[model samples]
Target: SHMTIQKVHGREVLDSRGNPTVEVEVTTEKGVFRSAVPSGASTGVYEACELRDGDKKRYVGKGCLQAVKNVNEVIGPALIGRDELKQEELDTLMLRLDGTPNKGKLGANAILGCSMAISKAAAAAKGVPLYRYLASLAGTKELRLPVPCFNVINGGKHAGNALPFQEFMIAPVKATSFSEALRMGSEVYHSLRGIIKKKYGQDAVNVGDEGGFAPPIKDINEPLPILMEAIEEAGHRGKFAICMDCAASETYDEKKQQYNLTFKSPEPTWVTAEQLRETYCKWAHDYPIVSIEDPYDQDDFAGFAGITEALKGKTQIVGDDLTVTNTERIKMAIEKKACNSLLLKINQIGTISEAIASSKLCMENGWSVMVSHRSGETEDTYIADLVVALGSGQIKTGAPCRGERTAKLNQLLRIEEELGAHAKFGFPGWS
Candidate 1:
């Protein structure tokens, strides 16, 4: 018997950020499954809509009662009796029912919760792991583990620092196993913490939403040397590499038409889009940075192209806000040669199929895909399975601390243990 959706319901739950969000439970003939949607601080303008109740008195106006109602009342009724295993078909029905361009009518939060839960239910029905089920749905023949990137330090919107960049991560590219990679990352993270504490005092160990330390460093370039020193101290200088989430769009001044990289670094300075691109090129040249995300504002296509052309194979120029996991936006990026890699966030597009479609399009165009987590996340490890399912080769799920961040990484470790010798790191360069 197929896994038929028997009932659907939703409730208000707290995300890792303590913000209210929609958590959905879908009961099927095979099993009951649940999932919660994660939110983002640096959200893209073109991402799918997440409905909120706008009641300022409740949870700072971020309540999702209306979204819950949509799930329990509208989407639930429409999905009843449908085959849960037909994940794509189920998602298509929900998309059609919403009818809005961005799933605004039913709410992406509601829709995504249901979508994710049903996916889990279907996997249970098939008596396969979520990743294997997803691979079947995605038509992926190969199964491989992604090289993990751990955000070791936080700044900008994710912290109270003058550094314009949002996140600084360490990638363990030389590890043979996911377990070993995390072990290397953990050693480096501990080493990095000690180094930051020694230089910036104990209070500097304060962490951000993703569990990365937030030192009160005003200069943007200072973190690189600290990270390199930490890597060397951990005895893995050549094995580890640097990655960044610049989140430069947050610093863009629309009226002034310049990116205001604010700092109390002796004096304030405004970096134009061109100068920022130049700065990125210089960083790539000088540092062990293997990847840079959102180096330019989302709308700065020409700036992205300039940096992409300049760096080429030297480093990965990634797009997060620029692509937003939308196929159309990715196509536009491809046409403009805006980036060499894409940061795939499932919540950005509201459904698994859409996210897979976006990644497929990018991979077809010779772009690397990196599954990522939101700054405001939960214990949901669906993305861990998703990366392996798609064989995407890369993931950024914050540091190896905090339950919300480590939940995904731990899940990946377990997955590796289960796969044993059959598992391999997806990136050929890493091997």
Candidate 2:
């Protein structure tokens, strides 16, 4: 009397950034469920392959027609009549069927679309919320609400601004509940808007893909003070802390063997990897920054180790592009002590089973786990439930604004309300 897969279909849909992505609909004996895939602008080289049509005429060659076709032709016929409730088993089949090291065969976009769709279908069949279904699958006994790493300012690939850093985030560290944390975050965000408007004019408040402001400021030191003032202005000075996504891989010059910190700077400055590490050390000591992601090149394990050693215990050194949600890469990072934190992105490795495996390995190594969103997101909100089920302790879902970003944030709020007294808030640095 278990739910069985009936049919699977896929379609092209527009993501938050107006780019086409894959969305799969799973039909099961119980019901129908759909899951949309997210796209990443500053994607890692080691990331699972996403099939693109490569037609420059369509969406500037960012179209996912091939991914859509893969879902309908390759993945659909194979899954029919299989037990829908066997999430890990189904995901494993998809991985094995692809047979490629990085899911380049059937395309990670196609595979992930089906994986997420099956999850939603199975959850519906069990008559439980998605998080509860995932928790049972992951053998999680307790559900924890993750601290929101609200991306307040955007740069790098996510924005058209001059700042070199990809994101400047704020976390409501002292909030007792997820709702309260969101409240504090929203207040500070609005305060930041007012501050930016006063300092840089009205257009400076214009937002980027993840809903963070893309101000035209060229100085890297400017956002920290602005964030600090906004935190104090919002009366969350002591309660809130800051984080950043350097996305340094975007600025690394392979041929020159140096980091060009002037992606948008008028007076460009170039530095060696060692100099970049020193800059990060100084920032960690000088500011309230508690976490930094992708601070060096993705493949620069030695550089990562050096920076991690210098900033050890002072703040979290997170691996995004460095790890790419791959288990082998995470193991390597653990061996080298490259970073203290793992940035979890489900699509980076393709299947939910693989993503969970990576998170499990990181947790086993005592590394902090942070489930993150792609800059180009959707309203699916699957990640919100994933974060709670994994009990990752931290999440970066862009700013509190924009429906696509807020979809996950709002899902967490609802999950908290549903859990009521059983709900627990996860504060990263605080015990």
Candidate 3:
């Protein structure tokens, strides 16, 4: 009786960036399960479309009025009285209802929020925590907590600076548990703030879109040494490893066939693909950088293949822009031997069933999966439970500063507490 979704509602909500986003509520006999969708700053072109209203008079054409309306008029009316526990059936019904391969008809934002809320409804209806219920849906026997990859340095489109890279992350891979891993992240973030303040002026302490500092530094490598010092200052030197989501597609010059290292500057320093690949290799050698995501342009499959080969045993190459969480793109990467890890973003695919399939395909190929969040997030902690349930053992939310970012981390903390000694946290090793 409780599994029946009684009603569905949609509302306009503000994300961390004050942009309008979609939040859908699914009601059952138990209660209402709601979820808010996240957007991305450097969203891949190949991703499913996130619907937005083009009404420039409101929110300067960034409104989600159309998205909210689509949810209320299309998705909500169809989902009433359906079995929420049949998540796959409901999700498939929505896909057919949209009548588009990419969920473009109804908007990924509308579909995703409804899909997420339904999953939460099923979890609550089953009388288990969200993670446990998600585990049942994914056929995962062991509920493993993910090692948090804290985004401590934000650049590229995420900040107002000229740094070429998007995110510089710290991965506490050696942490014995999730709670301790969170403490290390929090301490290291503060230490990083102190380091930034010491090198740059007080104005450098301004935060970025992902809760990381937006220091007016130009060089991409400038933040690396600062991060090292922060980790060492926090007394977690050897215990931590480095990760980077360069989002290099944002800098790729298709006509020149090179990366504009100074794209954010008045002058451009165009570098060949080999130069960029070698730079990553050299960085991995100098630092404990164990993972690099989208180190080359999305279409530069050869660039990714070469880098994946260059750092095969040394570092795990991850795909975000390259794959965009699409199974076809992921398969293309797999066939071309492009990378060894998948950066799983649910919003990229727009449904829980598809995301699970992406994880399954990646793991089947012996590739590690790192569940990820967008630069624009909300208080929704759904991904927190999704990662644990998928047994991915790796998560990359933002830094430990903002409440939106911390919401996911805090959910992980409670999950670890619930799992007790059986909970596990470590880097997902690639093959």
lDDT ranking, high to low = 3, 2, 1
Q: Which candidate leads the pack in TM-score?
A: 3
- Candidate 2, residues 1-431, lDDT tens digits: the string is 34688999999999998999999999987778899999899999999998899999999999898999999998999999888888889998998889999999899999998999898888888899999988887777668999999999877964788888799999997898899899999999999999999999998998888888888887667888899999999998798878889999998889888877786766767888888777788888888788899989998999988888887777888999999999999989988999989999998999888888888888888888889999989988999999999887799998989999999999999999998966889755653
Which candidate tops lDDT? Answer: 3
Q: How far out, in Å, is residue 216 in model 1? A: 0.8
Which lDDT tens digits does candidate 1 get at residues 33-104?
889899999898888997889898998899999999999999999888888888889899889989988888
Please list the C-alpha lDDT of all candidates, in the order they appear.
0.87, 0.88, 0.90
For candidate 2, give the lDDT of residue 135: 82
Candidate 3 has a TM-score of 0.98
Over 4 Å off, model 2: 265-267
Query: Cα deviation in Å at residue 272, candidate 3?
Result: 1.3
What local lDDT does model 3 show for residue 184?
95
Q: Rate residue 144 of model 3 by lDDT.
A: 89
User: Model 1 clash pairs?
Assistant: none
